[PDB]
Write a protein that binds this ligand. Structure first.
Ligand SMILES: O=C[C@H](O)[C@H](O)COP(=O)(O)O
Ligand SMILES: O=C[C@H](O)[C@H](O)COP(=O)(O)O
Lengths: 557, 557
């Protein structure tokens, strides 16, 4: 019995689910209350665009929403929120604070950990990034044969990769006068090799992104990259003009060969999957400039305040969270789809796949007790409308309930054909949620078939296949425009959604022990791969696999 | 009661699961049988590389596998298979043959549809494709100012987009001498605009890829591209030199303005999500050569044959399929992860996200009655090792059971650092499945913390967070090298996997009625977006959203 299954509010929610489940049909709910949208949507004015969070197409009623909020009061969301913002060490297994919110604390209101304000160091690195960006973008910083940097290569994996990648992709329109950026992460040699084959070492700046500076993929890639650079430059000292580091580890950085002046620092309280707001975002600032980088932080700060001062019942990240809890712990849905109707946000689903799953794919509570209820869902998605032709078929006519977040900006970065393309995009965005809610009844489909001139025969054989049972809930999140500021607010909104979920589940959203085992095991297998000798030191699958690898290494095809 | 649940073999399986599941533990199954790898693996020799399908780390015993095969027999998988290969119209709701096998039928064994061998029309398109490829790649085909083609842009969405995208990404190394390829698909203007901006119309060839040639996203992008092309060449006759079509609808192609000679055709028996093998695959052929395309087709041809002639119990796609049924229909897993340890295969999960989900995201059986069991799972994934740092945390220590397929080629296309990158990638590939299988007990974790010097209070608090329950099942799919041939075989292998599941569930994997409702509703909405009047014709949410979009399209941020 974990804290969540023991919570009376939680119990009350389950009870209600058992009793009224059948009473939750959207088409009826929307026919019965013409004011639904007005009662179940949030309109937020940031002063830099609006955000509409329309949760009306969800399987909920006021009564449900009330209990969901009560669950949050009962699980202590506010108090937990304050501990985070006050620099308390809520990452209780690592003994750490969780301060991504300090990285964008534009107010500079002091935040203390161990009785010491962090804003100065935070601001000191921001000033370093900023100067460095100016110098690189303007051409003041030159390579070893005196050329300006045309290409910047972030080398990192996970948290030291996905954020900078997703954000430079989403804000590509703001990169005029920026060097190109490349993201190398996989250990798979293809990644580094097909990237290096497209660069001139003279004009390439490598950024080695690593919190620990010991991660195997990143270090090997860094080393590989350094070796290629020296093949061309030959002089160790040229490295200082082409390699810089984003890390917390001055020593490992000093030993890799990087100039201590070339290290942009962050802190143990900056989680990787929460790190783009820090020195890790360097590549973002190089690409779109430091002012736009400041705009991104600044949008996170805005959402940070909203999370902090808004009553739970109207609080955006809190509501997205609770709806998730409703669907995960009462309805049992394993997944959550994130579907941005925006090509620029093509890695947005993937970024939150890491952010959500790495934070809440947990099973041990603060008391050290195994949970007896679900935790985080599997998160996935592709941008619309492409998905409409790929997997929406199953979302519409399969056997899974899939809560979905539809997102879109009102204004496109590219209003071609007098806005016709955006017009269509918007139309599909609106249409797909309508359809998923509404469905199409036997009779509706029947009337369609009659009007089409089908025989009662062909009609009878086809009829049942054109029926949509509807009642698939979605959220619709609409924003004026996708600028650096608005993106920051959005990214921040899901983060805090994730936090809330985690406090409700009594888990630690900020550690990630789950990665160790494979690593340890990887280190064991590496030396076992060299040589022709068969391997018998594991379970028979691992050996068989290894022996097939050795045998096939020799095949000519 | 659907065909599956009424079926006796299935009832036996459920019954076995009900009574034995508590005994399904990988550590113990492996400790008790040193022959498990030999007994639960398949090694196939294609004569162009070997495929080891290792399914020994699955929660199955000999009895379970025996009952699953029985189920395939009882459900009629072989007859169904034959009906497909013989041209029968098993795509019953549209009255269509399903013949993606005919497109890569290198044996030219006649395959008849309504009494006509289709092989000649298939081979004529192929010869035609080949002649075009040779003229385009060699420089013979000039643009409107006498320049050779340097860039090819495929315009299409879904089935006319993903395959060729995936395949070109995957075979990038075979593209020496080929023109660059670009894939425009989303209606979002960002896509065509950001692409056109990087193109010279004198050297760019467009391919409008569309089975129907009326899909809105595709025709519009096509119009946008044609308009853009015309602004520079100012000569309607130049279109013939820069625009070809891949479609089954000659009429609408003539209407669009594409010369009938510039039309590469296909047929209705080719499903979209099964079309890359056809004329839809022209961009593939352009990029890496007709020779390589041919190799892609034979690899698939080989797998078709393997699928057709191998007894069930040793048939790769059938076994993949049965394992899935077992996890879906007994265990209840909603998802299936595909995790290729290959950066070239970075779109592979996405491709089968469509192929699997669009095929078997269904709830209506052949008799026309609602299924009363689960069908298709949600498919998802990202290449390793990136995942180890993102969502693997959830796979290892969350609360969901997630069958995963790990794939890797033994031989890398880029053996840099004398193979060091590839050695590590393999080590991780191997160790991750070992770890999901084994876990790490409390006892084991304690010993590691004690050995690390942690205090009793340090160790006590951390210990349970470090425990891995294990028993997480995986398949490992290992193949000699990712050549065009092997790729064809692997894509074909999952294609037939999906087919088998579809047959077992008694659904139609080859229709997709689920896209219609949205399409209808978007046509309605388009016109209402024009102008600034409030809309009140839909449900309140659809209304509020439209109105909010109208309010905000005129905000200056
Ligand atoms: O995503 C997980 C971590 O961010 C990833 O393992 C990289 O860690 P690092 O920043 O220490 O290299
Ligand atoms: O995947 C679905 C179809 O392939 C897609 O809607 C495109 O259809 P089309 O090729 O006729 O344009």
């Amino acid at each position: 019995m974990a804290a969540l299954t023991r919570d009376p509010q939680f119990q009350k929610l389950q009870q209600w689910y058992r009793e009224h489940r059948s009473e939750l049909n959207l088409r009826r709910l929307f026919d019965a209350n013409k004011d639904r949208f007005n009662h179940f949507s949030l309109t937020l004015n940031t002063n830099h665009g609006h955000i509409l969070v329309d949760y009306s197409k969800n399987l909920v009623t006021e009564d449900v929403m009330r209990m969901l909020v009560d669950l949050a009061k009962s699980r202590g969301v506010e108090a937990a929120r304050e501990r985070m913002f006050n620099g308390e060490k809520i990452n209780y297994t690592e003994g750490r604070a969780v301060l991504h919110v300090a990285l964008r604390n534009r107010s500079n209101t002091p935040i203390l950990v161990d009785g010491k304000d962090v804003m100065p160091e935070v601001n000191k690195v921001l000033d370093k990034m900023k100067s460095f960006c100016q110098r690189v973008r303007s051409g003041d910083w030159k390579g070893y044969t005196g050329k300006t940097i045309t290409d910047v290569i972030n080398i990192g994996i996970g948290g030291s990769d996905l954020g900078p990648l997703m954000v430079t992709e989403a804000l590509k329109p703001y990169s005029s006068g920026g060097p190109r950026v490349w993201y190398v992460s996989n250990i798979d040699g293809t990644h580094i090799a097909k990237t290096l084959a497209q660069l001139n070492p003279e004009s390439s700046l490598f950024i080695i992104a690593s919190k620990t500076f010991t991660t195997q993929e990143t270090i090997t890639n860094a080393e590989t990259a350094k070796e290629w650079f020296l093949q061309a430059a030959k002089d160790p000292s040229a490295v200082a003009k082409h390699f810089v580091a984003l890390s917390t580890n001055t020593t490992k950085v000093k030993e890799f060969g990087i100039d201590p002046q070339n290290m942009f620092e962050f802190w143990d309280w900056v989680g990787g999957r929460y790190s783009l707001w820090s020195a890790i975002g360097l590549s973002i600032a190089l690409h779109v400039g430091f002012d736009n980088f400041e705009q991104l932080l600044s949008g996170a700060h805005w959402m940070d305040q909203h999370f902090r001062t808004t009553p739970l019942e109207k609080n955006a990240p809190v509501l997205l969270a609770l709806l998730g809890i409703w669907y995960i712990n009462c309805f049992g849905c394993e997944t959550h789809a994130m579907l941005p109707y925006d090509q620029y946000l093509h890695r947005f689903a993937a970024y939150f796949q890491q952010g959500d799953m790495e934070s809440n794919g947990k099973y041990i509570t603060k008391s050290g007790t195994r949970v007896d209820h679900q935790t985080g869902p599997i998160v996935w998605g592709e941008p619309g409308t492409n998905g409409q032709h790929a997997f929406y078929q199953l979302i519409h006519q399969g056997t899974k309930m899939i809560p979905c977040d539809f997102l879109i900006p009102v204004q496109t970065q590219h209003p071609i054909r007098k806005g016709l393309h955006h017009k269509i995009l918007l139309a599909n965005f609106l249409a797909q949620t309508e359809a998923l809610m509404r469905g199409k009844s036997t009779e509706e489909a029947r009337k369609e078939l009659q009007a089409a001139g089908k025989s009662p025969e062909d009609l009878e054989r086809l009829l049942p296949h054109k029926v949509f049972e509807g009642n698939r809930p979605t959220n619709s999140i609409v924003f004026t425009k996708l600028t650096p500021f608005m993106l920051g607010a959005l990214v921040a909104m899901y983060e805090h959604k994730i936090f809330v979920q985690g406090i409700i589940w009594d888990i630690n959203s900020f550690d990630q022990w789950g990665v160790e085992l494979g690593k340890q095991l990887a280190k064991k297998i590496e030396p076992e791969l060299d040589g022709s000798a068969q391997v018998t030191s594991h379970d028979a699958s691992t050996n068989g696999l290894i022996n097939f690898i050795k045998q096939q290494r020799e095949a000519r095809v």
